[PDB]
Amino acid sequence: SMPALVIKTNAKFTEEEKSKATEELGNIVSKVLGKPISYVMVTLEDGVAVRFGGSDEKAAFMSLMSIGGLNRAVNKRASAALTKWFTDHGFQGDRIYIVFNPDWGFNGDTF
Amino acid sequence: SMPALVIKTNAKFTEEEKSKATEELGNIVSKVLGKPISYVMVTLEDGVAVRFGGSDEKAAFMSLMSIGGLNRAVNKRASAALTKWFTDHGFQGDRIYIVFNPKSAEDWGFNGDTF
Amino acid sequence: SMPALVIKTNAKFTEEEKSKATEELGNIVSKVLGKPISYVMVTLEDGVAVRFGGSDEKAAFMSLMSIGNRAVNKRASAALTKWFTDHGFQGDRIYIVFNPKSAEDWGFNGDTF
Ligand SMILES: [Cl-]
Ligand SMILES: [Cl-]
Ligand SMILES: [Cl-]
Ligand SMILES: [Cl-]
Ligand SMILES: [Cl-]
């Protein structure tokens, strides 16, 4: 099983800031889900036109895919840990949007 | 209970046009789904390499996620209403692609908490 | 029915390279799934910040959605990856997602199925 985190935001990040974010956010996913960082895939797209709640204020949309291992308990801890990274980096917690989505391919073969 | 709309297109929009698109498209989703505009999330990515039907002509790809409130009936009106915005803004109706994806409250996060 | 392929990668493609990729990748999807090339939708986003397995080396993320298998999944995984390994990518840096949907959860030309 290998988790995936897809992030879209209207904030502007530098090339270094994006590199640190995918590292820090990927490590958060590794901790909450109990998987090694080797199995973690992180995608970050900045400068995206976003409107959340009628406003185009700084916001982020996130999707967390993982074959299994997602439950009411884990989703709440992942929501809190992922959101704090953003609230610690200039974001507002009410502008952060997370979807959990638990049939996968890797190196040309399925599992 | 909050819907999400993710839009990818190869057209080039100005910053003002992108702001207008997310507002108009967001209000379309609010009307069709029966939610206030406060709960609507809209994402618009322009200038993405798109090929639909072998051609890289002007096209758009769309995904609509919503905690519940997604049914065979609603999806049909949402498909029609969203397409009309594009056909009214320089797109051709046969180049528009929509995917509907309902999810649960436990599988959704907001303000560091689920539902 | 109608397949959809959404690709995210941190590699930098030229405008011509992107056009060739969506054609070649689109044709691979049409062949493996047994559907005409007319119903295939391909999206390619380059220059996306990607970190896979802790490393930000060249990588690609893929999602393949289709209304409604073990046979295709093996062929689609292998055929799509081979395109990338033939274009400077590493096969263990290629990430594919299969997402079957229902007829009522798909839209085209303002109507569902
Ligand atoms: Cl920079
Ligand atoms: Cl812990
Ligand atoms: Cl996406
Ligand atoms: Cl501009
Ligand atoms: Cl160029």
Short note summarizing the structure:
It is classed as cytokine. The structure is a homotrimer. Chain A is of the alpha/beta class.
Description:
The structure is a homotrimer. Chain A is of the alpha/beta class. Chain A has a single domain (4-110), classed as Macrophage Migration Inhibitory Factor (2-Layer Sandwich), CATH 3.30.429.10. Helices cover 32% and strands 29% of the residues of chain A. The first copy, chain A, contains two helices and seven strands; from the N terminus they run E-H-E-E-E-H-E-E-E. In chain A, the strands form two sheets. The first copy, chain A, has a four-stranded mixed β-sheet, with helices on one face. A two-stranded antiparallel sheet of chain A has the order 6-7. Chains in contact: A-B, A-C, B-C. Chain B binds chain C through residues 8, 45, 48-54, 56, 59, 61-62, 70-72, 75-76, 78-80, 82-84, 93-94, 96-102, and chain C through 2, 4, 6, 13, 15, 18-19, 21-23, 26, 37-46, 65, 101, 104-112. Strand 5 (96-103) of chain B pairs antiparallel with strand 6 (106-108) of chain C, so a sheet runs across the interface. The complex binds chloride ion (CL) (5 copies). The PDB classes it as cytokine.
Q: Helical segment tally of chain A?
A: 2
Q: The CATH topology of chain A, please?
A: Macrophage Migration Inhibitory Factor
Pair with the most extensive interface?
Answer: A-B, 34 and 31 residues
How does the helix and strand content of chain A classify structurally? alpha/beta
Q: How far apart are the termini of chain A?
A: 9 Å
Strand line-up across the major sheet of chain A? 2-1-4-5
- Kindly report the oligomeric state of this protein: homotrimer
Second rung of CATH, namely the architecture of chain A: 2-Layer Sandwich
Helix residue percentage of chain A: 25-40%
Evaluate the radius of gyration of chain A.
14 Å
Supply the CATH superfamily name of chain A. Answer: Macrophage Migration Inhibitory Factor
Q: Which band does the percent of strand residues of chain A land in?
A: 25-35%
Query: What letter string, H or E per element, gives the SSE order of chain A?
Result: EHEEEHEEE
Number of domains of chain A: 1
The dominant shape of chain A is: globular
> What molecules are bound to this protein?
chloride ion
Number-wise, the strands of chain A total 7
CATH class division of chain A: Alpha Beta
Instruction: Please outline the major beta sheet of chain A.
Output: 4 strands, mixed
GO molecular function, one term (chain B): dopachrome isomerase activity
EC number (chain B): 5.3.2.1, 5.3.3.12
Family (chain B): Belongs to the MIF family.
Protein name (chain B): L-dopachrome isomerase
